[PDB]
């Protein structure tokens, strides 16, 4: 905590389930945002920090909480982005062990996201500190003294804080999206790498240049798309549609009607086909005639 280590996160397809996987991970709290949306969030210049905490004051480590470690060793701005993740590192850090010293002596509280890297004997008292440590003059660092016996308190708990930077540049850190399977030869709606459309998808004989990804017809409507996952070029055709027209001899001369399905094979859209769903179009037993 006295001298924490910073990291920069960029061009990252980041999944947060891997952190969820580890069982010693017991602190998933995020003061800033709900973890449910966390994976779907898109960010850039994400910055993370890690340190060694007794775990008794981990509540003080939360933003807006005050403690001697929060006073000197570590600082968290009250406004928070990301999550504070703490897991019990008693397996490793315990043994006691005195390497990871933490500073409990400094002139003033540190500003948000500020490093206190240099240790100078603390002149808490009025007398000058000249002459190394002395009365009212103490070394800032204190041994963390991780004895394995001390279980309830000051036990080894590893805490790491995630901080998210808010879209200063175009976002470069996001989660995995657009992951479902592929189907063909059916009236379906698709989102091909953000290209949202609806139609029957089929393989195409068209030839795309390597940088080409979609193709449009004369009317500038998307008529072919290259699959993102597979380099296959798939043709898109709109789902079958057309006008319906009704032939009647007149209400008073009978009530039977004849339905004309304009400009479509009888085969593609038989009585099986919804729009006018109560119309069963009678049945195939009823005479079906194909005209131009």
């Amino acid at each position: 905590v006295y001298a924490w280590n910073r990291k920069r996160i960029s061009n990252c397809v980041a999944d947060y389930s891997v952190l969820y996987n580890l069982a010693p991970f017991f602190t998933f709290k995020c003061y800033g945002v709900s973890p449910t949306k966390l994976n779907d969030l898109c960010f850039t210049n994400v910055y993370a920090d890690s340190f060694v905490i007794r775990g008794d004051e981990v509540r003080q480590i939360a933003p807006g909480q005050t403690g001697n470690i929060a006073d000197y060793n570590y600082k968290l701005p009250d406004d928070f982005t990301g999550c504070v993740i703490a897991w019990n590192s008693n397996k490793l850090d315990s043994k006691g062990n005195y390497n990871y010293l933490y500073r409990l002596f400094r002139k003033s509280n540190l500003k948000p996201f500020e490093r206190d890297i240099s240790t100078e004997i603390y002149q808490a008292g009025n007398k000058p500190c000249n002459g190394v440590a002395g009365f009212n003059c103490y070394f800032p660092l204190r041994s963390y003294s991780f004895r394995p016996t001390y279980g309830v308190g000051h036990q080894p708990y590893r805490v790491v804080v995630l901080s998210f930077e808010l879209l200063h540049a175009p976002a470069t850190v996001c989660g995995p999206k657009k992951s479902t399977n592929l189907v063909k030869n059916k009236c379906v709606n698709f989102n091909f790498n953000g290209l949202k459309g609806t139609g029957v998808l089929t393989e195409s004989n068209k030839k795309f240049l390597p940088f080409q990804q979609f193709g449009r017809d004369i009317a500038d409507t998307t008529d072919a798309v290259r699959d993102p996952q597979t380099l296959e070029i798939l043709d898109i055709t709109p789902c079958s549609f057309g006008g319906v027209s009704v032939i009647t001899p007149g209400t008073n001369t009978s009530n039977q009607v004849a339905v004309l399905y304009q400009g479509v094979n009888c085969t593609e859209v038989p009585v099986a086909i919804q729009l006018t769903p109560t119309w069963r179009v009678y049945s195939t037993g009823s005479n079906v005639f194909q005209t131009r």
Partner: antibody, heavy 118, light 109 residues
Framework: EVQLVQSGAEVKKPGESLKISCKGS????????IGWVRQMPGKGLEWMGI????????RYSPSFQGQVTISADKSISTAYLQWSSLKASDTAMYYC???????????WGQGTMVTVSS | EIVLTQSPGTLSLSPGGRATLSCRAS???????LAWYQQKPGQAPRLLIY???SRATGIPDRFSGSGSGTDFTLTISRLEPEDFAVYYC?????????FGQGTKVEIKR
């Protein structure tokens, strides 16, 4: 107190498994990293590996990695080094001592003499 | 990896004197806090001094660790009769630890 009572010495021909049993007492088996150390007669000690009973996280010594099998049981708090089978060269003084990645001696067991001969 | 030569192999001196436990290392590892273990003949070794030079709990002050890097030394200011035993040095904070070859104490022959 915290003492690691080891199994008694054994004599056996090569080719059989020997689950040497080191019993630890006076401490939480989970809370502490245990481990094994081997000594050839007249040679310095060497590290065989360290096992974490809490997660059974067993880091074997690379030179002895896979050569022998080290295990333990939390319920009885006894180390169970299966040692795989037994080789004639494996006759040695094996101490079971509490130690971790920091490699502290903590408590050293009395040790067990394993003799492998015809 | 690090090979610890416990030079000299054997020390022959009068009781109560000081000695040098020169644990020469292949590479300089002071952060490893190399540990000296005292093994009595027919006894489980006892860590003489841990933390490079930190005093192991329940150890007489006549022992004193010192040195750094590739050269670590232990000086036993008052060589007591019980101190006549085998001494090892082992890398402490490093990757899979290796004990030294040993060092013995003697008076006459």
């Amino acid at each position: 107190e915290v003492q690691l009572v080891q199994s008694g010495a054994e004599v056996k021909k090569p080719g059989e498994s020997l689950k040497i049993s080191c019993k630890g007492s006076g401490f939480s088996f989970t809370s502490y990293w245990i481990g094994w150390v081997r000594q050839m007669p007249g040679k310095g000690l060497e590290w065989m590996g360290i096992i974490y009973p809490g997660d059974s996280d067993t880091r074997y010594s690379p030179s002895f990695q896979g050569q022998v099998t080290i295990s333990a049981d939390k319920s009885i708090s006894t180390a169970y080094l299966q040692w795989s089978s037994l080789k004639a060269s494996d006759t040695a003084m094996y101490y079971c001592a509490r130690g971790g990645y920091e490699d502290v001696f903590d408590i050293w067991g009395q040790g067990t003499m394993v003799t492998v001969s015809s | 990896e690090i090979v610890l030569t416990q030079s000299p192999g054997t020390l022959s001196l009068s009781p109560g004197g000081r000695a040098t436990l020169s644990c020469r290392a292949s590479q300089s590892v002071s952060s490893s806090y190399l540990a000296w273990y005292q093994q009595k003949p027919g006894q489980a070794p006892r860590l003489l001094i841990y933390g490079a030079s930190s005093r192991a709990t329940g150890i007489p002050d006549r022992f004193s660790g010192s040195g750094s890097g590739t050269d670590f030394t232990l000086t036993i200011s008052r060589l007591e009769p019980e101190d006549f035993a085998v001494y090892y040095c082992q890398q402490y904070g490093s990757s899979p630890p290796t004990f030294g070859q040993g060092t013995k104490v003697e008076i006459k022959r």
